[PDB]
Design a protein around this ligand. Sequence first.
Ligand SMILES: O=P(O)(O)C(O)(Cn1ccnc1)P(=O)(O)O
Ligand SMILES: O=P(O)(O)C(O)(Cn1ccnc1)P(=O)(O)O
Ligand SMILES: [Mg+2]
Ligand SMILES: [Mg+2]
Ligand SMILES: [Mg+2]
Ligand SMILES: [Mg+2]
Ligand SMILES: [Mg+2]
Ligand SMILES: [Mg+2]
Lengths: 335, 329
Amino acid sequence: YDYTDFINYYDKFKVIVYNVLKKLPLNDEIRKPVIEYYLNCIDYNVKKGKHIRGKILVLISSLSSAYSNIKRDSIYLLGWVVEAIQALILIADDIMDSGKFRRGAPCWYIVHGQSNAINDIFFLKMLSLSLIFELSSVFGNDIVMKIQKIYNESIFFTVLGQHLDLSYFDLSKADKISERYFSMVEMKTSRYTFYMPVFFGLTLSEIQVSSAQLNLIEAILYKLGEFYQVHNDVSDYLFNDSNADDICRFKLTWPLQKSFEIADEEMKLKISENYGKNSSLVKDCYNLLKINEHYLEYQRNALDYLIKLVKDITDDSLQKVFIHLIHQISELITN
Amino acid sequence: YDYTDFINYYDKFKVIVYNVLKKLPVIEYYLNCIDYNVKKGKHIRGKILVLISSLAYSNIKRDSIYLLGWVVEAIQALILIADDIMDSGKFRRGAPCWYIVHGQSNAINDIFFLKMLSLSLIFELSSVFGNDIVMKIQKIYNESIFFTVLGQHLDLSYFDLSKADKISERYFSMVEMKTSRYTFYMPVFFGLTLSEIQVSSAQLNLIEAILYKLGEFYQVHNDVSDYLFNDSNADDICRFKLTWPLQKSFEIADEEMKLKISENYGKNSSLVKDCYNLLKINEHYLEYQRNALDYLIKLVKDITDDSLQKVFIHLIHQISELITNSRSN
Ligand SMILES: O=P(O)(O)C(O)(Cn1ccnc1)P(=O)(O)O
Ligand SMILES: O=P(O)(O)C(O)(Cn1ccnc1)P(=O)(O)O
Ligand SMILES: [Mg+2]
Ligand SMILES: [Mg+2]
Ligand SMILES: [Mg+2]
Ligand SMILES: [Mg+2]
Ligand SMILES: [Mg+2]
Ligand SMILES: [Mg+2]
């Protein structure tokens, strides 16, 4: 789709941004490249990262209830709010995971120190919170309250998911591993990534009134969800050769859980051991059973399943939005 | 005061968090996070929420209030765990900082826990007071932590000693933002809201003028305690922080001491402190803290409502007692 226009709204978002930082009263503005620090921050973090999720809200927003003026902009804004929200999440993430890189540029916690990273996170959170309260002018009180409730659930869930991700207690005799993993992925990834933006979408959209069987869309966003997380995990096993990444950590991953549904007593002693220590050797075992083989299997049932539940949408017009959605996601994973 | 039983509602406050946690080990993780971080300490800021909220005794939004109080206790704890990382805190409230018992990745993550939680429990007050109140509660919170963060940025963003014509102005400006206003404006302003009191808005900026100096006076002491007792490189000076003492010493030092500070600032805090004592800076807090109180009292004495200068008399009493009955001899 076009989508160039959302992306052009940025500059009114920094207007709308900069036009908050009138925070102190009675001076000639000297103490006040604080306002310059955080515009910088925004260009760096919010101004990179594909803007996948903000797209999804603006996408979903433009079909369920086509717009034509003057709320159109309240949507772009939130879509950049989404992006600002996502960004703060992965600033946090890159810290916890000692990451190096993101959105092309190195990690913010790297450049501006970790102590500043932590402050800027909740800066971005607090601007998002207060920016969401702008809508009330354009969209009315209850439609912003439903937007709140959605912000809260998704960011909270992400926080419990991110907690499982951190949890030091992955064990040897683990046969629920597949269920630890996937249902964490639902929390730490699918909520903010797909649930939040899509469900944002049709608050602003406010149409149509689809209910009851509307657990269907939350069943697609779930799978899109782990579709993503499960692609991001593979690309890590496939595509980084550093002297410490993922399985260096005790990182509950897709190639590790289904190497635990195929491997033997002998293999599962392989993983257990040099996990956290020897990623190459663990990566080797991964090769042996060719992780990206079955990975290529996941993908087609994972698209098959999305496909068939696509053609079960009550909204012929929202049927195709998700088919659009499912399409770019795949492509985006296929790059 | 009591107060008993805002503290005793902590139980009922826990139950409401556990029920937020029907998602569905993590539960027992985060229930202990809150006991570890929220249950522990003086609870001064949630104490303030009720006090102000005290003198419409008509509904059982008296639980509701309490939970808010404990929501306010959560916000300070999740502020402060942030702080202890950024500052290399060792101990807070007599106990190992959270990022220490639970490392940085979790302390960072759990900050997000304490704060979404804050957000959710607030969101569910719509029933008890209804839409307009919550909406307004929602907007103190946003300013309060928003300014706190800017305030925390400034604490991180180091000053220019060389150009210290008025670092004091930075100091007090930073101070009002990183402290005053999640400590004082937010608690006080939540409680002014739940109450819905009659309402002397014109007479607002006065009590607003009070919170400014409740706040100032709060930090100013903290900064001096650190100066007075903290013995390490993990300290104010070694960490190169902008603080009442060094701010004053620049107001109070000849061109000798002041050049001799900005060199050991902040490597050999021993030497930085040596000066203060021969600036006798602890002399200068006391005449501060001395003038702090009456100016709060003058200030307090001008509150019109007369049922709202009451609790603002207890408020002023509480903090000064708090700030004065520390390590004395
Ligand atoms: O694998 P992670 O969960 O750390 C990641 O996917 C980020 N993330 C964090 C929460 N959900 C996803 P990324 O590989 O982008 O660093
Ligand atoms: O000295 P800080 O301002 O960092 C402090 O007073 C905490 N704080 C943080 C913001 N306002 C106050 P603490 O000495 O308790 O670590
Ligand atoms: Mg990561
Ligand atoms: Mg991660
Ligand atoms: Mg990853
Ligand atoms: Mg500190
Ligand atoms: Mg500090
Ligand atoms: Mg201090």
